[PDB]
Design an enzyme around this catalytic site. Structure first.
Site, short mmCIF file in Angstrom:
data_model
loop_
_atom_site.label_atom_id
_atom_site.label_comp_id
_atom_site.label_asym_id
_atom_site.label_seq_id
_atom_site.Cartn_x
_atom_site.Cartn_y
_atom_site.Cartn_z
N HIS A 130 0.84 -1.19 0.00
CA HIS A 130 0.00 0.00 0.00
C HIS A 130 0.88 1.25 0.00
O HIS A 130 0.58 2.23 -0.68
CB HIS A 130 -0.91 0.03 1.23
N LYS A 181 -16.85 -7.39 6.29
CA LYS A 181 -16.10 -8.26 7.18
C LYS A 181 -15.42 -7.39 8.23
O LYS A 181 -14.73 -6.44 7.88
CB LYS A 181 -15.07 -9.14 6.46
N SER A 211 -2.75 -7.68 3.02
CA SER A 211 -3.01 -7.65 4.45
C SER A 211 -3.40 -9.05 4.95
O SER A 211 -2.77 -9.56 5.87
CB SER A 211 -4.05 -6.61 4.78
N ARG A 214 -3.57 -5.95 -7.95
CA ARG A 214 -2.62 -7.01 -7.65
C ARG A 214 -2.92 -8.19 -8.56
O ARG A 214 -2.03 -8.74 -9.20
CB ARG A 214 -2.71 -7.45 -6.19
#
Lengths: 173, 159
Positions: free
Chosen positions: B18, B42, B129, B91
């Site tokens: 990031h 979530k 992450s 990504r």
């Protein structure tokens, strides 16, 4: 503070931007015009770089390609059109560009785009690749497909600026 | 004249990936906000306050960057912030398809906002992450993928 430092491009805020948008543009479509209009809105200068000698023999020669684009993009003040016969990174370097525009149409291309980006990072670290999705309106068009529809008399007036549509019809008798 | 870009995400927590994206974005646009989703569907490891605090420290050294939570439609946030660009890191192939959908919706909801995509550097091309958490949860060394401040806070969460 020039007598102490000329400056670095990273970690020090916003910098003058100059982008190349390379392609064969055989011929430039409205999908292309849309991409470069978007990139020209957010970068200081954009160069539409037209490949002189593509691997597959183009319908229009370089001089034709360059002329049609020039005309199609003249209403954008910060855009210029040039042909080039080098790597996109060498041209970038010659042009003192720091941004590389890439259109991102299909999932099938995403791997290749990533790989070419990594090659360009290795070639010219100070060159940044920036990826633009096409508009929904131009998502399914390509030079190749407009040419083939046109050859067999399909209507492609929606997809091209007028100067190109005329040049195209001339190429097809 | 001014370019002002939003980089939205959950950032639970912010990674070196990031940070690379926003360093790069902040070099090309006059200002960049890191926009941190308040209420992801979530529930995150780190609450908004922690996510924002962490990210602020990791990005303090960038003079034209600012970290903010947001809990509304991104169109409204960009409009509230007078942003005209949206930055997305890209990504995976899987993520391209979805982001192209959100982009078309954002075009409908806010025509004047241009979505822009950066590829991760090779270094950070496989980290997320979620993966760093997974690895860290079973005591894997993830020191290479996080800034110090985030690293310590993650170790704390897992003890």
């Amino acid at each position: 503070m020039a007598s102490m430092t000329g400056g670095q491009q990273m970690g020090r805020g916003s910098m003058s931007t100059k982008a190349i948008y390379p392609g064969t543009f055989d011929p430039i479509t409205n999908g292309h015009i849309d991409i470069i209009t978007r990139a020209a809105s957010m970068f200081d200068r954009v160069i539409l770089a037209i490949a002189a000698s593509p691997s597959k023999k183009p319908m229009f020669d370089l001089e034709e390609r360059v002329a049609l684009a020039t005309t199609a993009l003249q209403h954008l003040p910060n855009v210029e059109v040039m042909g080039f016969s080098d790597l996109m990174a060498n041209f970038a370097r010659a042009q003192q560009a720091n941004i590389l525009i890439r259109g991102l149409r299909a999932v099938a291309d995403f791997e290749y785009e990533m790989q070419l980006a990594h090659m360009n990072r290795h070639l010219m670290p100070e060159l940044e690749s920036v990826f633009l999705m096409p508009s929904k309106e131009w998502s399914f068009i390509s030079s190749s497909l407009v040419k083939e529809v046109a050859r067999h008399a399909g209507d492609v007036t929606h997809f091209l600026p007028a100067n190109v549509h005329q040049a195209l019809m001339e190429k097809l008798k």
